[PDB]
Each structure stands twice: as C-alpha cells, then as structure tokens.
C-alpha cells in the first residue's frame, strides 16, 4: 500500500478475493463507469441493456431524442422489466403481475391499484418511474454511470483528460458512431488490461512481432506517453509535416482532416501538427480503454476501439470491445476501418489474442502463495534514489495538458495503481435504502 506509492506492486493484487471485494465497495461504487454510446440508440424506443458489474441498466432513447438510464427492475417485486440485450420498444410489460412502463420510465399500468392497494395511500403510483441510475452523465455521447449519488460530475472527474478523449471521440460536429460490442470472458484480472493500455509501449515489439512479420504494417520509443486527470495514454511520433500532412499520413482523408479542425482547438491541433504525437492507446480509471491504429489496407487506414474491462471475479473479466468511427467518414472508409478493427483488436483481433495471453498468464502467478510474498518492479523511469531517468517534455515540445515524456517507461501504470490505492482506502460508500412505493 506504501509499496504501490514506491512503484512496487504486491503480486497478489491481481488474484485476491479480498481485494476484489474491497474494489467493489470502493473503486466500482465511486467511479464513473462506461455503459454505452448515444449512437447505439439513435431512434426513439431504441434501447440497450448494459451492466455495472452485476447491476442491469436500460439505456434508451425517448421520443424527444433524450437519453435515460433506468435500473432494470419492476417496482413491484423486482423482476427485470427487460430481458433482452437490445431492441426497440415504447414500453416494457412486467410478466410477473403486469405492471407496465413507458420507455422514459413512467409507470402506466398498475392493475387493481384502487381495489387492491387502496389507491395512492397504499402505494405511490402518481409520477413514479423505473428507478434512475444513482448518477448518470455523458461526454461526447459517451454515457457513464456512477453508483455514488454524490459523485462529482463526469466533466469534473475527467478534467484535463477530455483534451485527449476528443481525438478518439469527437472528430466532427456530426458526433461518433460506435457499434458492437463483441463480448467474451477471459481469465485475467480487470486491472492488467487497464494498465497495459494506459502506457505499455514496451510490450509492442515482442508481443506483436507476428503482426509486423505478416506485413500488416508499413521509432516506437520515440512516442510520447501522457497523463492528465484520471487517465493516460500512448502515442506515435510521426514524420515532419503539417497538421494535414500528418493526419493524411495516418489515413484520414482531406475532408475528414478538415472536419477535425472545426472541433479541435489550436492546442489540440498542435499536438499532432507541431509536436508530432498521434494517439495510440489510452486508459481512463478504472476500466475504460481506447486504441487507435492505422494498419496497411488490403496505403494505411485508421480504426478506433472502445472497450470496457467488466470485472467478473478476482480472476475473470468480460471484455466488451467496440468499433468506433466518425459518422461523416466515407462509407468505404467505414468498411476498411472496421476490417482493420476485426483483424487487430476485439474477439478475433490478432493483437488482443497475444495481449490476453500475457495478462492471463500474469493472473495465474498471482494465484499462488508466492504471489503474497513478491513485489513486482514497476519503477522503470525511476532510479533507486528517486531521480527521474529522463526529463518531462517542455511546453515547446508538447502542447497538451498534464505531463508527458518520451521513451519506454512505466509512469502511467504507476499512476493508475496510485489511483487504485487512493480509491481502495476510501471508506465504504453508504446510501440510505430506497423504500419503493413511498
């Protein structure tokens, strides 16, 4: 605990029942956790059911274009009011006793309310709804739930990181289009993936040779790793060039590049234009992750992926992998982008395949009693006396907020675990019980 603050990681944290139980009452009870994107429910009545651990939420679009999240639970005796993953409905009938709800949450049918309950005085039906998520918010159409009714806002949480998030999720005034997710279960602790994507450039050469060798791609250490607010990420150094040349060198068409400049600040442009750093992977604490890459086409073309590390146990995660692309991108661009997506990340991704082998194998060592005796070293970038190996990038070298460096390092992992430890020491969230029907 004092060890994590020194970049030394107790080995047993990736496979310990007690730490998982604790995480659930701290990390996952107090954080903004992703569930869905707006673009997945475009029409009125459209809905997805998505989970925050084991709690089931309906995220649906109402008939004024607004978006709601409702705890997936009939108000009577708790049956799930919606047992499909997604679909389109203007209402949800409960089959247990036939209470019905508009898709904005408002109750409609409550049979024999008068004769049985004794009207309002027996049960409150006037202006009732399916329970709202404890806290709901979004950014760039990305919808988050927080289980703490007193959390700060999403914007406040994300802080300076919104600057980076924008590269992945706001490339046009049109908004984002996300599809999926592919969903599969892996025997790896939720944290290991979060860390990897946070700032693991080091692994890429070794883990992913198979993918260079097969000629799928066209200086790795030259990339910047940045951290700002509660998230951080990796980037690639691009050859010299202007904003447009560099955007184009990576696979963006000209009109896409032009649309990007409408929504990105001068400051957000300079990171690509002057500094020459293009987003690669990123994590947001705790379990949200992004990857952006541009393989060779069957020229190169970029794809984006958004993914949730949904924790099942101390040693099991559900990966929810999404494809995303800007909505105004050419239809041909969308198809090629998705093709690269399928081939690189997700349930069939040839990168992910090997990444998950690494993580799964780590989780295995964390299982034993040896693990409860090792601190692993995550201090790359730091000397024994605490002095930095290399220097912070200056404001001339790097124009984005937070702190940045070049070279292989373990700064980001160290900060993610630092957040993990600050959260693990918070007191248990306490919330007064709701009495449904009062």
């Amino acid at each position: 605990m004092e060890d994590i603050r020194r970049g030394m990681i107790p080995a047993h944290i990736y496979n310990d029942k007690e730490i998982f139980e604790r995480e659930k009452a701290t990390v996952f009870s107090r954080s903004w956790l992703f569930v869905a994107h707006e673009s997945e429910v475009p029409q009125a009545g459209d809905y997805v059911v998505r989970r925050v651990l084991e709690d089931s939420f309906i995220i649906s679009r109402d008939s004024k274009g607004g978006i709601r999240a409702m705890f997936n639970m009939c108000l009577h005796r708790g049956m799930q009011v919606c047992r499909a993953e997604m679909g389109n409905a203007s209402n949800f009938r409960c089959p247990y006793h036939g209470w019905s709800y508009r898709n904005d949450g408002r109750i409609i049918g409550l049979p024999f309310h008068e004769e049985a309950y004794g009207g309002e005085e027996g049960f409150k039906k006037k202006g009732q709804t399916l329970l709202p998520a404890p806290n709901l918010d979004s950014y760039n159409g990305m919808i988050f739930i927080n289980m703490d009714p007193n959390a700060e806002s999403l914007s406040d949480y994300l802080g300076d990181f919104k600057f980076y998030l924008d590269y992945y999720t706001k490339q046009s005034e049109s908004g984002l289009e996300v599809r999926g997710p592919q969903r599969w279960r892996v025997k790896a602790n939720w944290k290991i993936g979060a860390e990897n994507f946070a700032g693991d450039m080091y692994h890429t050469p070794q883990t992913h040779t198979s993918v260079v060798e097969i000629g799928l791609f066209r200086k790795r250490k030259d990339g910047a790793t940045y951290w700002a607010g509660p998230g951080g990420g990796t980037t690639y150094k691009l050859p010299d060039g202007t904003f447009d040349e560099r955007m184009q060198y990576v696979g963006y068409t000209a009109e896409m590049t032009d649309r990007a400049k409408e929504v990105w600040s001068d400051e957000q442009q300079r990171v690509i234009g002057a500094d020459g750093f293009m987003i690669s992977a990123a994590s947001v604490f705790p379990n949200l992750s992004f990857v952006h890459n541009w393989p060779k086409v069957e020229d190169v073309l970029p794809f984006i992926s958004i993914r949730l590390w949904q924790p099942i146990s101390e040693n099991e995660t559900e990966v929810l992998s999404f494809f995303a692309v800007d909505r105004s991108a050419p239809e041909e661009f969308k198809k090629k982008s998705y093709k690269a997506y399928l081939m690189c990340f997700g349930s069939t991704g040839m990168f992910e395949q090997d990444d998950v082998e690494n993580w799964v194998s780590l989780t295995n060592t964390s299982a034993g009693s040896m693990a409860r005796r090792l601190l692993l070293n995550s201090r790359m970038g730091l000397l024994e006396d605490g002095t930095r190996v290399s220097d912070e990038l200056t404001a001339d070298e790097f124009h984005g907020p937070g702190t940045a460096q070049v070279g292989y390092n373990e700064a980001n992992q160290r900060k993610l675990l630092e957040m993990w430890a600050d959260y693990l020491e918070k007191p248990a969230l306490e919330v007064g019980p709701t009495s449904v029907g009062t």
């Binding site: 047992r83 499909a84 993953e85 997604m86 679909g87 389109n88 409905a89 599809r179 999926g180 997710p181 592919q182 969903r183 599969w184 279960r185 892996v186 025997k187 883990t207 040779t209 198979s210 993918v211 060798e213 097969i214 000629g215 799928l216 069957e298 559900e318 494809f323 969308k334 198809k335 998705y338 093709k339 399928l342 081939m343 997700g346 349930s347 069939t348 040839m350 992910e352 395949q353 090997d354 998950v356 082998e357 690494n358 799964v360 295995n364």
Partner: protein
C-alpha cells in the same frame, strides 16, 4: 446474414433450392466428405492445406449474436461480427500462425471439431451446393483450466473447381451471446 455483413458486398449470392438431397446422393456424399476432411485439417491446425480449399472470393462470417425479443426481426449485433473475412484476411490470419510467433497458441490448444447434422441443397447456380452442418468445438490448453465448448450452426456454399469442391461462403451462427473462450485463435 452475408448480405447484412458490413464486408459482404463482394460475396456470392447463390442460395439453396428445393428440399434436401437424399443421403446417398453423390453431391451430398461429396459435401459431407468435404466437411469431415476440413475437420481433420482444423484439428491438426493444418491451416495452409485448409486455406487451399477456400475460393478466392470467400466470404467467411460469424456475426455477434444478441438475445432479443420475439418480434424484433434480428438477433445479431448490427454492424458487428466476430469474423468478417475475405481470402486476404483469412490468409494473413493463417500467415500469423505460420510465423510461430503467435504466442497465445504456443503451446497449441488441443482441438476437436465435431461435425454433425449434415444436409445438402441444390442451388440456383450450376456448380454450387449449399451445406448445413452443426459444429461443436471442444478445446483444452495447458493443465489447470477446464475445457471450453463452442456450439454453432453453419451454412456453407461449396463450388466445383476442377475435380474438387471448395468453400465459397461460410455463415456461422454461434450459439452464445458472450463467448466463454479465451480467444478465437482457431477456425470454425
């Protein structure tokens, strides 16, 4: 499904006709023989041999299935598959195993593609059969974890090319919403 797939534009549109062939029909016997020989190939991870039995315009597709209400008129994730492959991508996938630097499959899984319920249809084009099969993949790796099952149905389009049948389309209906396997570094 092949028509709804994002990358299905170039895919063969031939479809079945009539009722299933009898089980002594030569064209059924060939289709069956093909599918059992594939199984032996996929068990041994002879991906190169396998890849030579696949036409150059293959569409190999396995959408993500999603649990939905009865009159919703779809049961797959709109615009998202597990596999959506042409001949290029399938070969680059196999090329990867060929490097022997695909870490997640060294050591190799132990694989058993069980194939059952085979039946064959004449199509609306000359040298083409449609073949339905059910495939249950059993998979074990290492000495700790329990084995995984994968259950699925398949519709295949076989095409005659010389004295040999070849796979022109594959649609895989997977029987799970959420997959319980570490990866799909295999083929179905």
């Amino acid at each position: 499904y092949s028509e709804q797939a994002v990358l299905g534009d170039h895919a063969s549109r031939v479809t079945r006709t009539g009722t299933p062939l009898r089980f002594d029909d030569r064209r059924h016997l060939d289709a069956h023989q093909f599918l059992i020989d594939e199984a032996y190939l996929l068990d041994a991870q002879e991906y190169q041999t396998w890849l030579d039995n696949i036409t150059d315009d293959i569409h190999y597709l396995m959408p993500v299935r999603v649990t939905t209400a009865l009159n919703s008129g779809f049961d797959t994730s709109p615009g998202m598959a597990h596999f959506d492959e042409n001949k290029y991508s399938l070969s680059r996938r196999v090329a990867r195993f060929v490097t022997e630097h695909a870490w997640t499959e060294d050591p190799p899984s132990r694989l058993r593609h069980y194939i059952t319920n085979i039946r064959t249809f004449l199509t609306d084009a000359e040298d083409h059969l449609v073949v339905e099969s059910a495939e249950l993949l059993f998979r074990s790796r290492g000495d700790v974890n329990e084995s995984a099952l994968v259950s699925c149905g398949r519709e295949d389009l076989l095409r005659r090319v010389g004295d040999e049948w070849k796979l022109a389309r594959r649609t895989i209906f997977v029987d799970e919403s959420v997959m319980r396997m570490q990866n799909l570094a295999v083929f179905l």
